[PDB]
Write a protein that binds this ligand. Sequence first.
Ligand SMILES: Nc1ncnc2c1ncn2[C@@H]1O[C@H](COP(=O)(O)O)[C@@H](O)[C@H]1O
Length: 127
Amino acid sequence: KVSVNDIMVPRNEIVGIDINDDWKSIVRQLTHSPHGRIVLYRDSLDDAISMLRVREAYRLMTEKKEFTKEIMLRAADEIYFVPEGTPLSTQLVKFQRNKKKVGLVVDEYGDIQGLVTVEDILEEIVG
Ligand SMILES: Nc1ncnc2c1ncn2[C@@H]1O[C@H](COP(=O)(O)O)[C@@H](O)[C@H]1O
């Protein structure tokens, strides 16, 4: 059967930010985000921390108080993790019940394989 593995964005192609970069570098990356959500991590995808809704960050950035790293991090949501090889069928449900919209595909070793989205699953199912 067709599985999550077939449609995920491969690990190498996941857009995220190393929260270790100097602040000006982090903001520059944030404002240049090619996607709606992006991964916050420390050093590499061996240490993914949270999923940040870019639109939310932008929104916070426009406000009166200085936008900070602390503010950014508390604005991100915990990552939703999907086992490797979960079938599209099963994931469709766990996402419907989840109302979550994005997941990181993960090994049994905790090793991120890719990124998957409900948009992605549906469009595949229907073609
Ligand atoms: N942070 C990301 N890194 C890599 N690919 C992504 C990311 N977010 C979304 N995508 C893919 O690009 C598609 C368009 O989403 P978006 O650009 O956020 O509207 C999604 O269905 C994902 O498959």
